[PDB]
């Protein structure tokens, strides 16, 4: 019914008269209908967490219940929009209030009402016994968002009674009528879902057909697959943003989700008005990209709880769009900010941190967040499939040992990319520590390798082993200098250097390195492997490696310039150029073996 | 050959004898010092939490 | 124009105030009072001491007829019975006009120039206007300072917040003085300064520089000295930021402000938190600096609305020559890069003793290239950084027993580092360094290697600017 | 105001020390090995500093305008001393030039003579500003003249062995009685300077 504010100790609120309240349900607290969720309940004493800033409040003020946990709207219009952790429209709010700042305690439905949508009726007709998830029609929004599948919410069934014809509708009116035991199942052009419970799926499913990043070092050595996990160390200048743009415009998935947690705002505006000029790299380069992009941003200025809930919002949206039988991927801003906000909430509410100052719930919550990603069978009549992949952004910090959040996250995630300090010192990026980085999708994608480039696996294995041996011997040489060096040792050092200046170097601004498809990487990889083998076999029969290197000469420059081939000038044409280079290379090295 | 070999032997032996007792003890003591620092920080944090 | 006149006319009635008693106890800076009726939140209360002295404080946490108020001017000498409290029913208001420039104010924002009060054109809050993220724009038009190592290796643009790391006994104050004195565009700046817990000599020095420079009429100041009570220190930054925001978004000026010493502010926050019972964070510090520091720094930059611009230069003191300490560690995540001054360079007699490796900037892409600078800038900076690091590594190797494993590149980097420091790094207190001449010096230093080791440079730049 | 500290927690950056340093303009670090070396005052010239010379330059120019410009070189001598000692521990004295040995020996002489107030006497209890300034002058003159003589061509070992008692004279200069009228001491400093410069001139080449 109603309760009275009893005590305020910051964002947390203590309220009385609260009997029969859920462990999680929204409450419009405050005389200005402030949003809030209960956390601790005892007797009639309720502890409410306020998602906005508390100021000017006083004891003895109405408290109104809502009878449902935090939710999120779902339906047409979710695409090409910018929201907060609370789904609240921003451009609409901005253009409505005429101000430069969000008003205190303002409510506005997420999706824009009063917007007509052309609905196409589905196969089902009156009398059919139907359940939730079944696609009972579709709506066309725009290119790359055409045929927005209209769904029935899970846990909803009965028997269709009257479905409206095709036409234009606004997302507030039920057009389907269903009965389980009464005229009590009405569904408009949208639905909602609590942001806590993972949306159920028909059944899990493994993954293959790996992902494309345009980064040779990752795309060839530590790959990832759609409907998979990942761990990204970012340094805001180590190319994280540029690779985000590259994957966004090359995204094999149809739609992508990026969140903002702890963003600095300046970068927020930069990316926000950078996207409007990124071009969709399908059907040519279509100028708009919002048609395949959804963004949620919540800077540090935002209240802590909203930053906490932003990632849940994002993952829920990802689940929904996957459940339309599609390929989508999620882009994480920074998990460290989320962990810090969680620690703040824990401490403020009153707890006993025991990790190093963090609540023990961190591992469990991270796991729960890392169990909504993968490939699974979409629910509904057509019996289709989706996929959800997540990339996690982490900010390494602390001394040379302490890194608890990293230790917890790396325990369950498999696709992990390390960080190399040295390459960063030399301004050389992507700066990825080869030694520590590790993946596991190589074993499963063995099949795709066989189908397409069956020699790739052993090729990369030998390359990696050579690099490892070189980096093992480098420090040994450092403490003793150059002596007792077999020709093979110097061969290994030179080939390693050439590799890490042709493969592990990429600039998002040069026309070439911006994106290197798998075939192009395979081409350079064959070239370099052939180079190392040719040198090794030239010195094998006994020779002066110096003279052999001098005779080779320009071949090194040619294989280096190999990067300067325009991607797919002609896919076979580039391959033809590589074959020409390889033939001349065999000639120049066979004339040198003697 | 005698002259050159004697020179290099002198150089290497001098460097080895240096590294034997000039570099090692410094790090040996530094590790224990840092360990003591960390132990004290652990104790004080534990006391705060117990309080 | 009638809208604002009628808005003010709304606040045109007398509102009676209560007057309480029965302070149920006091503990340190915190006062416990339990008789209140309808206690509000975040309101200022006037306290009349038994001797008739008037002080003010703010409520922290309320409860069933129980409120906890901190005191801005200490707590000594107060009686349970002979003390009274009045409630004003408002958060901390502040008067503002277009005429604070050239006026000096104390920690509590009162005039200390022997002049009259402000007689403000309007009142304001200190925490309001949570700026809408949508309308914000990012910095452009790279801003010039005349300092090479600042404007070249970590070039910055107008409207970008960035702090300065410092330690005991280092020349950061006059560095900021030089910056503000000789800062300008690349082809004027109202200045707001806030002091907190600083030795009087520093404030005197800053005032001397400003009045000497003739910019005193272009600036307003807030002063809070070390001798002053600590609790006041958690207010001055808000006052300064509110002043700057009003002057930018309603007076439409390009403004720069300088926060003085966040170390003391964080310490004071820790002390006030410790007064209450709270599960401490790391090092015992309260577990929620992040929110407060964000609320502090977030105010910055410009918006689509108008021309007014804001720039933050907080100054921090390093406790024990480390960034791992909670204060700098937290500060790192919130702001765009940071400029660093190192101990060794100062002990080498090099001014400014700036170490570039730890320092960096988070925004140059809109502040480099042609149209504003010379296109070479990025490659110049990158190559210089790489060779600096390489020279450091070579020097570290040299320390083993000597040049047992030595290369020509090692010697090359050695002289490069030496000359770089002693010539480029050492900039006098008045040595103006335009971007053009700074880049010319950098290029002259670059004519120390063949055209082979310079891998981080485009061949076009290499050819067109190796020799002329 | 002046005060002392008692760091015993296992470091020398304990919160009391850090807080003190945060507000202090003059810092006087102290070593301990010097006590076992019976060297007093046992301060650490390596880790210490002050922030008043800038303004004291005005007073110096009022009375001792030459004074400030000497202390920089004075400290640079020590800086070079501890910059060179490393190779001494590493491979001993094998590649030292004559200049390096000059700097080493003059720094050692400074440490022994000018950096000791040991004992209790007229010269072991107090030192006036002018006497200290004259000792600065003598030390710097000796160093620069030896360096110049070797630079112009002089076997430094031979040059030192021949100069000889210049070291004893300059060292004993401290043993004067301070406050002998500020003239007799001044006259002795003047004659010592003249004698040392003439001796260098004879032995310079």
């Amino acid at each position: 019914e109603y309760g009275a504010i009893y005590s305020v100790s910051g964002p947390v609120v203590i309220a009385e008269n609260m009997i029969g309240c859920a462990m999680y349900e929204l409450v419009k607290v405050g005389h200005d209908n402030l949003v809030g969720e209960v956390i601790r309940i005892d007797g009639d004493k309720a502890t409410i967490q306020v998602y906005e800033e508390t100021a000017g409040l006083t004891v003895g003020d109405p408290v109104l219940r809502t009878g449902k946990p935090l939710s999120v709207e779902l339906g047409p219009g979710l695409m090409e929009t910018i929201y907060d952790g609370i789904q609240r429209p921003l451009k609409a709010i901005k253009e409505e209030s005429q101000s430069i700042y969000i008003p205190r305690g303002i409510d506005t439905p997420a999706l824009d009402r009063t917007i007509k949508w052309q609905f196409t009726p589905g196969k089902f007709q009156v009398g059919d016994h139907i359940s939730g998830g079944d696609i009972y029609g579709s709506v066309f929004e725009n290119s790359l968002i055409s045929s927005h599948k209209i769904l029935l919410p899970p846990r909803s069934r009965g028997t269709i009674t009257w479905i409206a014809p095709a036409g234009e509708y606004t997302l507030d009116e039920k057009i389907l009528e269903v009965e389980f035991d009464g005229k009590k199942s009405d569904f408009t052009l949208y639905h909602t879902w609590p942001v806590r419970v993972p949306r159920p799926v028909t059944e899990k499913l493994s993954a293959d057909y790996p992902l494309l990043t345009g980064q040779r070092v990752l795309d060839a050595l530590f790959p990832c697959v759609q409907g998979g996990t990942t761990c990204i160390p970012g340094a805001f200048g180590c190319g994280k943003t540029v690779i985000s743009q590259s994957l966004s415009k090359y995204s094999n998935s149809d739609a992508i989700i990026y969140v903002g947690c702890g963003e600095r705002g300046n970068e927020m505006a930069e990316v926000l008005m950078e996207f409007p000029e990124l071009y969709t790299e399908m059907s040519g380069t279509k100028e708009p990209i919002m048609k395949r992009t959804t963004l949620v941003a919540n800077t540090s200025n935002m209240p802590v709880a909203a930053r906490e809930a932003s990632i849940y919002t994002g993952i829920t949206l990802a689940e929904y769009f996957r459940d339309q039988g599609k390929n989508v991927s999620m882009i994480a801003d920074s998990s460290s900010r989320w962990a810090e906000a969680l620690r703040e909430i824990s401490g403020r509410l009153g707890e006993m941190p025991a990790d190093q100052g963090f609540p023990a719930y961190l591992g469990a919550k991270l796991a729960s967040f890392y169990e909504r990603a993968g490939k699974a069978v979409a629910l509904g009549s057509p019996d289709r499939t989706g996929s959800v992949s997540i990339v996690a952004a982490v900010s390494p910090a602390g001394g040379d040992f302490s890194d608890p959040v990293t230790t917890a996250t790396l325990g369950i995630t498999q696709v992990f990319w390390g960080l190399d300090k040295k390459l960063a010192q030399r301004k050389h990026f992507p700066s990825i520590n080869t030694s520590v980085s590790y993946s596991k999708y190589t074993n499963v994608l063995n099949k795709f390798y066989d189908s397409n480039y069956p020699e790739f696996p052993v090729l990369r294995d030998r390359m990696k082993e050579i690099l490892s041996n070189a980096e093992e011997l480098e420090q040994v040489v450092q403490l003793v200098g150059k002596s007792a060096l077999s020709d093979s040792d110097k061969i290994t050092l030179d080939v390693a250097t050439l590799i890490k200046e042709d493969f592990l170097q990429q600039n998002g601004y040069s026309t070439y390195d911006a994106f290197c498809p798998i075939w192009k990487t395979f081409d350079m990889m064959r070239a370099f492997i052939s180079y190392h083998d040719e040198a090794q076999k030239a010195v094998a029969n006994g020779a002066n490696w110096s003279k052999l290197a001098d005779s080779t000469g320009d071949v090194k420059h040619a294989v280096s310039s190999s990067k300067f081939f325009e991607p797919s000038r002609g896919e076979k044409e580039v391959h033809g150029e590589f074959e020409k280079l390889l033939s001349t290379m065999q000639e120049r090295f066979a004339e040198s073996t003697d | 050959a005698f002259i050159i070999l004697d020179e290099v032997i002198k150089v290497t032996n001098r460097r080895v004898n240096a590294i034997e007792h000039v570099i090692i003890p410094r790090t040996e003591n530094t590790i224990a010092y840092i360990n003591s620092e960390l132990d004290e920080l652990d104790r004080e944090e534990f006391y705060r939490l117990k309080k | 124009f009638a809208i604002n006149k009628k808005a003010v006319e709304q606040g045109f009635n007398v509102k009676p105030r209560l007057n309480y008693n029965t302070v149920s106890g006091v503990n340190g800076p915190l006062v416990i009072l339990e008789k209140v009726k309808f206690p509000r939140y975040n309101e200022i209360v006037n306290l009349t001491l038994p001797d008739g002295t008037v002080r003010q404080g703010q409520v922290l946490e309320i409860r069933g007829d129980r409120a906890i108020v901190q005191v801005f001017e200490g707590t000594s000498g107060i009686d349970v019975k002979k003390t009274t409290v009045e409630f004003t029913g408002e958060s901390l208001r502040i008067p503002v006009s277009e005429d604070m420039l050239g006026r000096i104010f104390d920690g509590s924002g009162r005039p200390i120039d022997n002049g009259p009060k402000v007689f403000a054109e309007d009142y304001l809050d200190i925490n309001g206007s949570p700026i809408n993220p949508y309308a914000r724009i990012y910095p452009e038009e790279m801003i010039s300072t005349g300092v090479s190592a600042i404007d070249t290796m970590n070039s910055i643009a107008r409207g970008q917040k960035i702090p300065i790391f410092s330690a005991s006994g280092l020349p950061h104050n006059e560095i900021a003085a030089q910056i503000c004195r000789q800062a300008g565009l690349v082809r004027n700046f109202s200045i707001v300064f806030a002091a907190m817990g600083v030795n009087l000599e520093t404030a005197r020095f800053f005032k001397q520089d400003f009045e000497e420079n003739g910019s005193l009429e272009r600036t307003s100041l807030f002063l809070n000295l070390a001798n002053d009570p600590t609790i006041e220190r958690i207010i001055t930054p808000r006052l300064a930021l509110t002043t700057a925001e009003y002057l930018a978004y309603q007076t439409e000026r390009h403004v720069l402000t300088i926060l003085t010493d966040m170390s003391s502010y964080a310490d004071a926050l820790r002390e006030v938190s410790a007064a209450r019972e709270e599960v401490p964070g790391r090092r015992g510090y309260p577990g929620y600096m992040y929110t407060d520091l964000s609320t502090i720094y977030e105010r910055a930059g410009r918006v689509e609305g108008r021309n007014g611009s804001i720039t933050q230069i907080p100054i921090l003191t390093m406790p024990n020559d480390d960034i791992t300490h909670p204060i700098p560690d937290l500060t790192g995540y919130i702001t765009e890069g940071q400029i660093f001054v190192d101990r060794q360079l100062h002990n080498k007699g090099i001014y400014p003793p700036i170490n570039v490796l730890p320092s960096l900037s988070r925004l140059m892409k809109s502040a480099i290239g042609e149209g504003m600078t010379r296109k070479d800038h990025g490659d110049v900076s990158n190559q210089l950084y790489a060779k600096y690091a390489i020279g450091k590594d070579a020097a570290a190797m040299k320390a083993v027993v000597g040049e047992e494993a030595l290369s020509i590149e090692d010697k090359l980097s050695l002289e490069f580092l030496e000359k770089f420091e002693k010539t480029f790094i050492t900039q006098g207190a008045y040595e103006d360094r335009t971007v053009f001449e700074s880049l010319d010096q950098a290029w002259s230093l670059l004519r120390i290697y063949p055209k082979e080791m310079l891998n981080r440079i485009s061949p076009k730049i290499l050819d067109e600017f190796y020799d002329r």
Side-chain angles (χ1 to χ4, degrees), chain A residues 14 31 74 99 126-127 130 256 273 328 360 386 444 465 588:
Chain A
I14 291 295
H31 188 274
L74 298 171
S99 74
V126 176
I130 189 165
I256 65 167
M273 66 181 180
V328 298
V444 66
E465 183 176 358
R588 300 278 187 148

mmCIF file of all heavy atoms in Angstrom, chain A residues 14 31 74 99 126-127 130 256 273 328 360 386 444 465 588:
data_model
loop_
_atom_site.group_PDB
_atom_site.id
_atom_site.type_symbol
_atom_site.label_atom_id
_atom_site.label_comp_id
_atom_site.label_asym_id
_atom_site.label_seq_id
_atom_site.Cartn_x
_atom_site.Cartn_y
_atom_site.Cartn_z
ATOM 1 N N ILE A 14 16.281 3.480 4.200
ATOM 2 C CA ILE A 14 15.585 2.605 5.133
ATOM 3 C C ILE A 14 14.143 3.074 5.231
ATOM 4 O O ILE A 14 13.883 4.255 5.495
ATOM 5 C CB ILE A 14 16.258 2.613 6.514
ATOM 6 C CG1 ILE A 14 17.628 1.936 6.451
ATOM 7 C CG2 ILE A 14 15.372 1.929 7.539
ATOM 8 C CD1 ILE A 14 17.581 0.457 6.128
ATOM 9 N N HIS A 31 8.675 11.731 -2.634
ATOM 10 C CA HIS A 31 7.500 12.478 -3.055
ATOM 11 C C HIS A 31 7.523 12.803 -4.541
ATOM 12 O O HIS A 31 6.502 13.246 -5.074
ATOM 13 C CB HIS A 31 7.396 13.763 -2.233
ATOM 14 C CG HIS A 31 6.124 14.518 -2.450
ATOM 15 N ND1 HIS A 31 5.967 15.434 -3.466
ATOM 16 C CD2 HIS A 31 4.951 14.497 -1.775
ATOM 17 C CE1 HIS A 31 4.749 15.944 -3.411
ATOM 18 N NE2 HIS A 31 4.112 15.392 -2.394
ATOM 19 N N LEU A 74 11.019 -4.530 -24.827
ATOM 20 C CA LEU A 74 11.529 -5.327 -25.933
ATOM 21 C C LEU A 74 10.562 -5.234 -27.100
ATOM 22 O O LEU A 74 9.357 -5.434 -26.924
ATOM 23 C CB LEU A 74 11.709 -6.789 -25.518
ATOM 24 C CG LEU A 74 12.714 -7.047 -24.397
ATOM 25 C CD1 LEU A 74 12.630 -8.494 -23.941
ATOM 26 C CD2 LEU A 74 14.120 -6.711 -24.857
ATOM 27 N N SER A 99 16.739 21.453 -21.776
ATOM 28 C CA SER A 99 17.858 21.728 -20.894
ATOM 29 C C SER A 99 19.132 21.110 -21.459
ATOM 30 O O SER A 99 19.183 20.649 -22.600
ATOM 31 C CB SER A 99 17.580 21.197 -19.490
ATOM 32 O OG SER A 99 17.689 19.785 -19.453
ATOM 33 N N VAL A 126 -6.716 -18.137 -35.927
ATOM 34 C CA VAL A 126 -7.553 -18.316 -34.750
ATOM 35 C C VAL A 126 -7.768 -19.795 -34.477
ATOM 36 O O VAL A 126 -7.852 -20.615 -35.397
ATOM 37 C CB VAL A 126 -8.895 -17.585 -34.934
ATOM 38 C CG1 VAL A 126 -9.815 -17.859 -33.756
ATOM 39 C CG2 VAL A 126 -8.664 -16.095 -35.097
ATOM 40 N N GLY A 127 -7.837 -20.140 -33.194
ATOM 41 C CA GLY A 127 -8.025 -21.500 -32.751
ATOM 42 C C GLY A 127 -6.741 -22.266 -32.523
ATOM 43 O O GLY A 127 -6.766 -23.299 -31.844
ATOM 44 N N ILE A 130 -1.021 -21.999 -29.166
ATOM 45 C CA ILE A 130 0.305 -21.431 -29.354
ATOM 46 C C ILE A 130 0.909 -21.110 -27.996
ATOM 47 O O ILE A 130 0.204 -20.868 -27.014
ATOM 48 C CB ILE A 130 0.268 -20.164 -30.235
ATOM 49 C CG1 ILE A 130 1.684 -19.727 -30.606
ATOM 50 C CG2 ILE A 130 -0.465 -19.039 -29.516
ATOM 51 C CD1 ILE A 130 1.726 -18.722 -31.732
ATOM 52 N N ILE A 256 25.497 -5.664 -33.323
ATOM 53 C CA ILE A 256 26.465 -5.647 -32.238
ATOM 54 C C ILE A 256 25.922 -4.791 -31.107
ATOM 55 O O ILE A 256 25.135 -3.864 -31.325
ATOM 56 C CB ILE A 256 27.839 -5.126 -32.705
ATOM 57 C CG1 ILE A 256 27.751 -3.657 -33.127
ATOM 58 C CG2 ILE A 256 28.353 -5.968 -33.857
ATOM 59 C CD1 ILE A 256 29.097 -3.001 -33.307
ATOM 60 N N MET A 273 29.517 10.541 -31.767
ATOM 61 C CA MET A 273 29.440 11.193 -33.065
ATOM 62 C C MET A 273 30.513 10.722 -34.035
ATOM 63 O O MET A 273 30.687 11.343 -35.090
ATOM 64 C CB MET A 273 29.520 12.704 -32.911
ATOM 65 C CG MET A 273 30.804 13.241 -32.399
ATOM 66 S SD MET A 273 30.433 14.989 -32.343
ATOM 67 C CE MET A 273 31.937 15.664 -31.736
ATOM 68 N N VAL A 328 24.868 -12.161 -33.174
ATOM 69 C CA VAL A 328 25.150 -10.873 -32.559
ATOM 70 C C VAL A 328 26.313 -11.040 -31.596
ATOM 71 O O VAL A 328 26.633 -12.144 -31.152
ATOM 72 C CB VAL A 328 23.924 -10.292 -31.827
ATOM 73 C CG1 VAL A 328 22.791 -10.055 -32.809
ATOM 74 C CG2 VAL A 328 23.486 -11.220 -30.707
ATOM 75 N N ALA A 360 32.885 -11.629 -1.716
ATOM 76 C CA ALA A 360 33.097 -12.954 -2.281
ATOM 77 C C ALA A 360 32.142 -13.258 -3.426
ATOM 78 O O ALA A 360 32.367 -14.228 -4.158
ATOM 79 C CB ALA A 360 32.954 -14.010 -1.189
ATOM 80 N N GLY A 386 20.468 -19.149 -32.880
ATOM 81 C CA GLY A 386 21.158 -17.900 -32.661
ATOM 82 C C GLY A 386 22.543 -18.127 -32.076
ATOM 83 O O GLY A 386 23.019 -19.259 -31.951
ATOM 84 N N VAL A 444 38.871 -27.174 -31.785
ATOM 85 C CA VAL A 444 37.579 -27.397 -32.421
ATOM 86 C C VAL A 444 37.583 -26.895 -33.860
ATOM 87 O O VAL A 444 37.039 -27.558 -34.751
ATOM 88 C CB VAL A 444 36.454 -26.740 -31.601
ATOM 89 C CG1 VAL A 444 36.591 -25.227 -31.596
ATOM 90 C CG2 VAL A 444 35.090 -27.159 -32.133
ATOM 91 N N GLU A 465 56.478 -22.108 -32.216
ATOM 92 C CA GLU A 465 57.605 -22.764 -31.561
ATOM 93 C C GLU A 465 58.911 -22.047 -31.871
ATOM 94 O O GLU A 465 59.764 -21.880 -30.989
ATOM 95 C CB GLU A 465 57.683 -24.226 -31.991
ATOM 96 C CG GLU A 465 58.787 -24.998 -31.297
ATOM 97 C CD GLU A 465 58.784 -26.464 -31.658
ATOM 98 O OE1 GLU A 465 57.891 -26.883 -32.423
ATOM 99 O OE2 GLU A 465 59.672 -27.197 -31.177
ATOM 100 N N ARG A 588 65.827 -17.681 -55.975
ATOM 101 C CA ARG A 588 66.902 -16.956 -55.312
ATOM 102 C C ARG A 588 67.499 -17.736 -54.152
ATOM 103 O O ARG A 588 68.648 -17.479 -53.779
ATOM 104 C CB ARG A 588 66.393 -15.604 -54.814
ATOM 105 C CG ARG A 588 65.858 -14.701 -55.913
ATOM 106 C CD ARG A 588 66.975 -13.958 -56.618
ATOM 107 N NE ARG A 588 66.455 -12.978 -57.565
ATOM 108 C CZ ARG A 588 67.043 -11.827 -57.862
ATOM 109 N NH1 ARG A 588 68.191 -11.469 -57.307
ATOM 110 N NH2 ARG A 588 66.465 -11.012 -58.740
#
